[PDB]
Amino acid sequence: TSVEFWQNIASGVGKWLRAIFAIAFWSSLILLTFYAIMTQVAPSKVFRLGALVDLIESVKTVLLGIFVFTASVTGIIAGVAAIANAFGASFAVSPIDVVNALIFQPIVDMVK
Amino acid sequence: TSVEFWQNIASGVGKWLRAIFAIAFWSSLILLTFYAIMTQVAPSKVFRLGALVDLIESVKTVLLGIFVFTASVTGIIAGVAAIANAFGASFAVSPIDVVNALIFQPIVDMVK
Amino acid sequence: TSVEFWQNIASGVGKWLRAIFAIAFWSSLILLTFYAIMTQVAPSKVFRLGALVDLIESVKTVLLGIFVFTASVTGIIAGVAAIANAFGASFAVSPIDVVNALIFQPIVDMVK
Amino acid sequence: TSVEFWQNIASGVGKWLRAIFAIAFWSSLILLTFYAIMTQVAPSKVFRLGALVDLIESVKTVLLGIFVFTASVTGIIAGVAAIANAFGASFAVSPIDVVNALIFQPIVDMVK
Amino acid sequence: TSVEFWQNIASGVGKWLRAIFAIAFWSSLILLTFYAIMTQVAPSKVFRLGALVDLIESVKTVLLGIFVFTASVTGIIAGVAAIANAFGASFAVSPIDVVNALIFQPIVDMVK
Amino acid sequence: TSVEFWQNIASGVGKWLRAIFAIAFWSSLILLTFYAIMTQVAPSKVFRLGALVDLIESVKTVLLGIFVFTASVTGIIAGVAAIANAFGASFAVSPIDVVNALIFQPIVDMVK
Amino acid sequence: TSVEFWQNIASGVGKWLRAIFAIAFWSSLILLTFYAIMTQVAPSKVFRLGALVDLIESVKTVLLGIFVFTASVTGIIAGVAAIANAFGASFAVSPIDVVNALIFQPIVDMVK
Amino acid sequence: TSVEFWQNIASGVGKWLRAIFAIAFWSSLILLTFYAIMTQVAPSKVFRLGALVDLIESVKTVLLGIFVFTASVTGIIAGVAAIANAFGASFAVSPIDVVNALIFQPIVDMVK
Amino acid sequence: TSVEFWQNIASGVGKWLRAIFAIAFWSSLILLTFYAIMTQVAPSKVFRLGALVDLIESVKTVLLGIFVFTASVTGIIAGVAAIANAFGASFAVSPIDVVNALIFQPIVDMVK
Amino acid sequence: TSVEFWQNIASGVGKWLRAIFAIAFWSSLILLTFYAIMTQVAPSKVFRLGALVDLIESVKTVLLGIFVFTASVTGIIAGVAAIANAFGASFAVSPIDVVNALIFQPIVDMVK
């Protein structure tokens, strides 16, 4: 119906999504903690060993997911910036600012 | 539904998990004590010897579990900090503070 | 063919599904009991230990499933209620009543 | 096919399982008795000593199993009761009644 | 190409499948026997104990599989019979006859 | 490929397994005899005492294994017979005949 | 690109696979030998007993694998031969020759 | 990479394993000799008696291990030979030659 | 707009794609290395075994992918060359040069 | 974004992985040393015997893992080299250099 309506809805959903993404990262951390208490308390050696293995699995998968997310954001922004070339068009969007704000800004300002 | 709802639930579950993790560490200590009384009271020499061996087993496994937990936390935090590089992004999260608060802060403030 | 026909079929299948869901929850409880007798009777220590571990696995998975179900119901109802906004539409559905009736009402009125 | 069919089958299997669980507990008691006669009759001192040790092993493992069972039942019921909160839902199930009926009611009414 | 061709092929494959299903049930029985001789001959106590545990595992899994099969057959036949209702259609198929012939008829007429 | 092929292979392996099971039982008997000659010839008192203890161990473990085997066979056959109920299905398999033929028939017809 | 090219590549990979399969069978034999020396040299009785048990495990699993392989080959060839029927088609492939050449021909011509 | 490479590696490891197995058998013999000198020199009667008992233990365990090894080799070879039947396949491997070469050929050609 | 514009863009994207394909192959190699360290460090035997299995999985899938890629390139080039026939048209493109340059040229000139 | 960026990241992760792999091998050596001190200090004979057995287990598993790693690397490189054939393509990669640099070069230059 009107432009600022869509602007407001997009901004709201964006902030909600980045907030819940930070919550998701810290939930991965708490799941790391849960596997820690599991390997601390599990009676048999084999269960503690399996808890250590899946702890390493969780840390590796969270790191890989973060890597893919940041790499994809940088890739899309740099691809659009480069595709502005070969045509003469100027794309001054400062990719570092957007890749910082979308990825690491919501994460940092949290205390557990 | 709302952001602070998820924030509160995550904070509550985090504090509960760290508290029960400290309880778990001190339960490992009391299990050490139980093996101590076992090797103190076991009539035959062989049973006292086995109690000593599994006492050493328990101390080694608790130390290894603590090592894996702290190493994994430091590894994930430092990996995200380093992956902030090569892209120009800034990740000022003070990894020492989080590795202290998640690992050793709940443990220290307990008296048995 | 006619409206009340579909109304009746939907109501019947809904009541059947909630009844069998309560049966499912209490079957999870009886499976907990089965693991209890397993760890009570299993001759070797290792089998009792594994029964304890999978008992904890069962309780954690049933709790997680209940959490996801209730959270999803609350999320859909609150999302529709909020999407009634930004347009002026009124959605007076009392989400608490529906999340109670769909989730906890069938469960409570059962005795094992 | 029909609701009361599943209700009857679940009730029957539940009563059978709790009865056999009480039988299991009293079988642990009779195994205690068997180790008692073993340490009473075993000719060499070492065999009587080992019978005493495994008698203590049996009593400790039965006590630990009972503890884990009752703690898990209380934990699941209290977790569902608490998860009824933060949403406004009411869960009036009287956890004490169910933890009594599932755990200690079948055990008490037996004479050996 | 022609109706009785498909009728014959379906009947043949059906009889072959039910015969091999009865063979499968009696092979589960012989596997029970193999675990019996294992726990009878295994030198160490721990191996006999594990053979007893996996013997119980095998009997429980065969019983659960038979239960799921018969329950699914009864469920599909009764569901089609009930779905004949609410429309006025008549479905006189005698579900007991089919659930007997598909499940227990091939099994009974075998001697090991 | 064909039904009677599988029938013949199953019957052959079944008879072989029951024959070797009877051989296993009588080998348990000969091991009892070996412990008897050990406690008869062992020079020191302690070795004769230990031979008596492990003789009792062998007899108790063979009796327990036989008990578990026969109880499991009776349990599976009676469970299938009872699960034929609640559905109307008839399961006329004469459980006593099968529990006799699988358990005690191969054992009896042997002379040592 | 051309027919005999694919013919040659398929023949080469087939001969390589059957040769390495024969190598695999004889490696199972050498693993049997390794468990033999383990149970011959293992100092404690329990380790020799476990080596005997896993030796039996290895022989049973190799025999079961060979059985499944030969049964599957015979089953596929006989199924295609039978499916040539009911349509009038002739399938003169001599299943015995192929089941011999694929299974036992590479194995026999080896000396360890 | 190539067939004769795997052939050579398998042959080499096989010869090494059979040689060390013969060394193991003769080491069992030298351990018999060590128990002989122990019972010859042990001052107290009880220690000589215990040395005699564990000497008998060693001879019985070496004989049992050799029996299990040769029986397992004969069993696997005869099982594959018999499983060649019921399918028409020919398995001309001369089981006696392989059971001789794998078991007794390395042992005989040694002088202590 | 102009021919050499499209020529330049196609050449640039082609070189970028072949470079990242070589990077992908060497990343498959480093993933092989990661599974190697996993099976080297994994505490329990089962985890090392699974790491070996998925290591073999990775090598087989990389080899199959390379095979499909090179076979598809050769197939398309040879198909166009052959379709030049039956019409009299000449297609002198030297398929070996293109299948070398597109497949193996980017891979070889890399050092890890 | 750019080629040398991916080149640098791949080279860095490769060197890090090979360094930590060498660390892993020497950690296997130190674990061998730990089992050595265990069997040196363990009071009862049975514990020293078990330490010897698991010492042999550790050496065998490290040797098997190294074998699988080097064999897989040689296999993939030789498979790609051979698949360069049958198409005319040239693959001059010197497999010996890569199998040396990826496997043994990081290991050798370490002093413990």
Author numbering:
A (entry chain S), B (entry chain O), C (entry chain R), D (entry chain N), E (entry chain Q), F (entry chain M), ...: 38 to 149
Q: Paper's wording?
A:
Here, we determine atomic structures by cryo-electron microscopy of three conjugative pili, two from hyperthermophilic archaea (Aeropyrum pernix and Pyrobaculum calidifontis) and one encoded by the Ti plasmid of the bacterium Agrobacterium tumefaciens, and show that the archaeal pili are homologous to bacterial mating pili. With structures for four bacterial conjugation pili (pED208, F, pKpQIL, and pTiC58 from A. tumefaciens) and two archaeal ones (A. pernix and P. calidifontis), it is clear that there is a common architecture for all and obvious homology, despite negligible sequence similarity. Each prokaryotic pilin subunit consists of two or three hydrophobic α-helices, with kinks appearing in some of the helices, such as in A. pernix and A. tumefaciens. Hence, pore diameters of all prokaryotic conjugative pili are sufficiently wide for the passage of ssDNA, but not dsDNA.
Cryo-EM analysis of the P. calidifontis filament preparation revealed pili, which following the reconstruction to 4.0 Å resolution, proved to be structurally similar to the CedA1 pili of A. pernix. While in the A. pernix filament the helical rise and twist per subunit were 3.6 Å and 76.5°, respectively, in the P. calidifontis filament these parameters were 5.0 Å and 74.2°. From the secondary structure and side-chain information present, we were able to determine the pilin identity directly from the cryo-EM map using DeepTracer-ID39 to be P. calidifontis protein Pcal_0765 (WP_011849449), which we name TedC (see below). Although TedC displays a similar fold to CedA1 from A. pernix, the two pilins are processed differently, with A. pernix pilin not being processed and the P. calidifontis pilin, similar to bacterial plasmid conjugative pilins, undergoing proteolytic cleavage. Notably, however, the mature P. calidifontis pilin contains an additional hydrophobic α-helix (α3) compared to pilins encoded by A. pernix and bacterial plasmids. In P. calidifontis the extended density could only be explained by a bipolar cyclic tetraether lipid. The cryo-EM map was good enough to identify the cyclic lipid as a glycerol dialkyl glycerol tetraether species (GDGT), a dominant membrane lipid in many hyperthermophilic archaea, including Pyrobaculum species, and we have modeled the simplest form, GDGT-0, into the cryo-EM density. Most of the pilin-lipid interaction network in the P. calidifontis pilus relies extensively on contacts with helix α1 in the asymmetric unit (ASU), but the lipid is sandwiched between α1 and α2 of a subunit in the neighboring ASU. Thus, the protein-lipid interaction stabilization relies heavily on hydrophobic interactions for P. calidifontis.
